[PDB]
Each structure stands twice: as C-alpha cells, then as structure tokens.
Amino acid sequence: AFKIQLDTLGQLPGLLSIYTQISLLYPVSDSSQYPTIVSTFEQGLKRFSEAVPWVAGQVKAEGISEGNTGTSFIVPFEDVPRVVVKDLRDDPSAPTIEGMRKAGYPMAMFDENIIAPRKTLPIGPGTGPDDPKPVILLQLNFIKGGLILTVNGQHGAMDMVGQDAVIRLLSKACRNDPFTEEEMTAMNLDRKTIVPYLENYTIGPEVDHQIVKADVAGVSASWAFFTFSPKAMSELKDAATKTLDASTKFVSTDDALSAFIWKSASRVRLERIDGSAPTEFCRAVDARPAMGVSNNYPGLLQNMTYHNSTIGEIANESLGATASRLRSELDPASMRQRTRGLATYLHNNPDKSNVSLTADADPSTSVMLSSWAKVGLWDYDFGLGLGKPETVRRPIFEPVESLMYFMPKKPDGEFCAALSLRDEDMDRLKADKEWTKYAQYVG
Numbered sequence: 001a002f003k004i005q006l007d008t009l010g011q012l013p014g015l016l017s018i019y020t021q022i023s024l025l026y027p028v029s030d031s032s033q034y035p036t037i038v039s040t041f042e043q044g045l046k047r048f049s050e051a052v053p054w055v056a057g058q059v060k061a062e063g064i065s066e067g068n069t070g071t072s073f074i075v076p077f078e079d080v081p082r083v084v085v086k087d088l089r090d091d092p093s094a095p096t097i098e099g100m101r102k103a104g105y106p107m108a109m110f111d112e113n114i115i116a117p118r119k120t121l122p123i124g125p126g127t128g129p130d131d132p133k134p135v136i137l138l139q140l141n142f143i144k145g146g147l148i149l150t151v152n153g154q155h156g157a158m159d160m161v162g163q164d165a166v167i168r169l170l171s172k173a174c175r176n177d178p179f180t181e182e183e184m185t186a187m188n189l190d191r192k193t194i195v196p197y198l199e200n201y202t203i204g205p206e207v208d209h210q211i212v213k214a215d216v217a218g219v220s221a222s223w224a225f226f227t228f229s230p231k232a233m234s235e236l237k238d239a240a241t242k243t244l245d246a247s248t249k250f251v252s253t254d255d256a257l258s259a260f261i262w263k264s265a266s267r268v269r270l271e272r273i274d275g276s277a278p279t280e281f282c283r284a285v286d287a288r289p290a291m292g293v294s295n296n297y298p299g300l301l302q303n304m305t306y307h308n309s310t311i312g313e314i315a316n317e318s319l320g321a322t323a324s325r326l327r328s329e330l331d332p333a334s335m336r337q338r339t340r341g342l343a344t345y346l347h348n349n350p351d352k353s354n355v356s357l358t359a360d361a362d363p364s365t366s367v368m369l370s371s372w373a374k375v376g377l378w379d380y381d382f383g384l385g386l387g388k389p390e391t392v393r394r395p396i397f398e399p400v401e402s403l404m405y406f407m408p409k410k411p412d413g414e415f416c417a418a419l420s421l422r423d424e425d426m427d428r429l430k431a432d433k434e435w436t437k438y439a440q441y442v443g
C-alpha cells in the first residue's frame with residue numbers, strides 16, 4: 001500500500017488532466033523478434049513494480065467540493081503498469097519503418113490515436129474525472145520493420161524530467177540491471193514537502209502571470225516538426241553570442257533556438273497584427289537544480305519563465321537581444337523564490353482553479369515552449385537487442401495554438417522542434433527565407 005500526496009505544483013488543475021506522451025522508434029530486422037521484445041518488456045515492468053510499487057499506481061483526487069479543488073495522491077491501482085501491445089504490421093493506415101525514414105519521422109506519423117495508450121488531452125472515452133488516471137501507461141506498436149514504444153505519464157505525477165527518470169529505470173529493469181541507492185532514494189523522496197513554503201505569504205510577484213483574472217485574457221491550426229542541423233544550431237548560437245546585452249555574459253544553444261523561434265513567429269505575425277501587439281514567451285524550466293533536488297526525482301518540479309515585449313520589438317531586435325531576455329530569468333535564486341511562491345500560493349488555497357502556468361498567455365501572440373532537449377531518452381535500449389532509438393518523437397494530438405516542444409537532442413546535436421500554429425502563421429513561416437535558412441520542415 002501507498003498514499004503519496006502529489007507535489008504541490010502537481011495539484012495545478014491543468015496538469016491533473018493531461019498525459020505527456022513520447023515515442024521511441026527502433027528498427028526490428030525480423031518479425032521473429034517480437035515475442036521476446038514483449039516478454040522482456042513485461043518482465044521489466046514486473047521487476048520495476050516490485051522495486052518501486054507506486055509506479056503501478058493511479059492519481060486519485062479527494063476532498064473535492066464547491067470552492068475546494070481537493071488534493072490528489074498516488075494510490076494503488078494494478079499490480080504492474082499497463083502495457084498495450086498493438087500489431088500494425090498489416091494495417092495499411094499505420095506507419096512503416098521505410099515510410100518513416102523517407103519522410104524524416106514526421107509528427108503526423110506518430111498519431112496518438114494509433115500509437116499511444118491514452119490521449120494527451122481529456123477528450124473522448126475514459127477521460128472523465130471518475131475514470132482511473134494511471135501514473136504511467138505504455139504501448140508497444142509493431143510496425144513493418146520496426147517497433148514504436150510510447151510512454152504516457154500523468155502530468156500531475158511527473159514532468160518530462162521525472163518521466164525520463166522513470167523510463168530510465170524501466171530500461172534498467174528490462175535489462176535486469178540493479179538500481180543504485182541514490183536512484184532508489186530519489187524515487188521515494190516525499191513530494192509534499194519538497195518545495196519549502198514561504199512564511200506568512202499571501203500574494204507577490206512570484207505568481208505574476210500565473211493567476212487567472214477576469215480582466216486579463218489567457219482557429220484552424222496544425223502541428224509540424226522542423227529540424228535544425230548541428231551546424232544550424234551552432235550558427236544560431238554564434239549569431240546570438242555576437243549580439244548579447246551588456247548584462248548577459250553568455251547564452252545557451254537552447255536559448256538561441258528559443259529566441260529564433262520567438263523572433264520568427266513574431267516576424268510572420270506582423271503580416272496579420274500590428275507591431276505594437278504585446279507578446280509573451282512562456283518557457284518551461286526544470287526547478288530541480290534551483291531547489292537542490294536530484295535529476296532523478298521522478299515528480300513534478302517545474303515552473304515557467306515569462307518574457308513580455310511587443311511583436312515588432314521581438315521581430316526587429318538582434319537574436320542576442322532576444323536570447324538575453326530568456327537567459328536573464330534563469331538565475332537559480334530567482335527560480336527558487338518564484339517556485340516557492342507558486343507552491344505556497346497553491347498550498348494556501350483550497351480552490352486552485354484560478355492557477356495556471358499560462359494564465360495570461362494569448363494564443364494569438366504568445367509562445368508556450370517546453371524543451372525536452374536535455375532528457376536522456378536516446379540512450380535507452382530496454383534490453384530489447386535492437387540498439388538505441390532511431391528517433392525520439394512526440395505524438396501528434398489536437399492543435400494547441402502557440403504550444404511548442406523541443407525533442408530530446410539527437411546525439412549528433414540535431415534539434416527537432418514541434419510547433420503548433422494557426423494555418424496562416426504556419427504557411428508564412430514555412431515560406432519565410434530567414435526561417436528556412438535554419439529550419440527544415442518535416443511535418
């Protein structure tokens with residue numbers, strides 16, 4: 001038995017209704033290999049569950065009433081995490097290894113309805129509040145010449161850093177490799193106390209842009225992957241580094257690409273709105289380092305940084321000026337104070353319904369980006385004997401205007417950005433020469 005209160009940050013209403021999906025593609029030389037793939041994977045899930053029982057649990061809310069959004073806990077569910085096995089080898093609507101390779105692994109070929117065990121959003125059958133919310137769900141998809149492994153994580157229970165930590169240990173378990181003491185410790189840290197609260201706190205700048213207000217706001221669209229070569233990435237960082245603000249010593253590769261996207265989106269948006277239009281960049285940031293928490297902590301410990309300007313200013317300023325905006329918010333002391341503030345506000349409020357990481361983001365003019373660039377998914381083989389993933393891609397789901405992801409970085413340095421934009425923005429972006437100089441459309 002177990003009853004593990006979610007991270008206070010994981011009590012965010014938005015996170016409690018969402019599943020984060022990621023797919024790993026492996027080539028499979030011969031269909032003779034599938035039975036052992038499945039048994040190895042099932043045995044791994046069993047071993048993992050025996051070692052860390054809560055991974056087989058579910059997220060369950062209690063104490064809900066009028067003006068009380070309740071408190072969720074990880075509690076028992078089934079003996080092992082659920083894996084679904086789907087054979088798509090003979091399905092003419094399914095992807096194939098050669099189709100994937102020819103098209104460069106587009107998002108459209110990772111259809112969540114076909115290759116994921118549950119949808120990202122609370123849409124359709126089995127996504128109601130009374131329906132179970134398993135902590136993790138897995139799907140093994142056999143495709144012609146390949147295997148797609150998809151992992152869903154309940155977002156209240158884990159951010160992608162936590163999900164990566166869970167998946168990493170699942171790979172060990174599949175191989176029958178032992179967990180380290182530090183791994184076992186990280187997997188079992190108490191969550192409800194992991195962010196120390198602020199004393200006598202009501203409301204401060206810490207929760208700016210995170211509480212919905214009635215006088216503050218916060219279309220045909222699509223998803224597409226764009227790739228950026230290692231050379232494109234280094235040239236973007238070079239361009240930014242040459243043009244930094246005086247207050248900024250350095251920026252990162254991730255900063256530079258993030259800035260380039262904000263600038264490029266803002267540029268194409270000038271074709272439909274005025275340069276004076278406000279624009280907010282919302283950037284997901286792992287709060288573990290600022291909090292002094294292990295990278296192996298499997299929970300939800302994330303915040304955003306917010307950057308407000310105008311469409312014209314962002315479009316027209318140097319790349320370094322834009323990258324400097326992003327880097328300026330990553331001071332550990334600032335991240336810690338802000339994150340403690342958000343956690344404290346949540347803790348102090350039985351009604352959490354007004355709190356949102358994108359509370360004042362306007363989908364028309366904002367960018368909401370989460371970078372998974374630094375997660376370790378490219379390294380896991382799960383004892384399957386297939387080698388490392390050929391690609392690591394997020395499944396396509398409903399378009400969500402201005403939502404964006406960076407995939408885990410390909411070992412050679414290649415980046416893959418998933419962008420969701422309204423059609424007129426997407427079309428203009430794809431035809432924009434300043435964008436296509438660096439960005440290769442995949443789809």
Ligand SMILES: C=C(C)CC(=O)O[C@H]1C[C@@]2(COC(C)=O)[C@@H](C=C1C)O[C@@H]1[C@H](O)[C@@H](OC(C)=O)[C@@]2(C)[C@]12CO2
Nearest residue numbers: 014015018159284285302303304357358368369370400
């Ligand atoms: C459409 C949903 C109903 C709300 C939404 O935009 O969710 C995004 C953003 C986000 C969660 O959104 C909210 C409002 O909490 C998450 C997943 C999804 C589907 O991805 C990314 C990430 O996992 C979340 O951010 C965190 C956890 O800090 C998130 C903010 C994101 C863009 O950064």
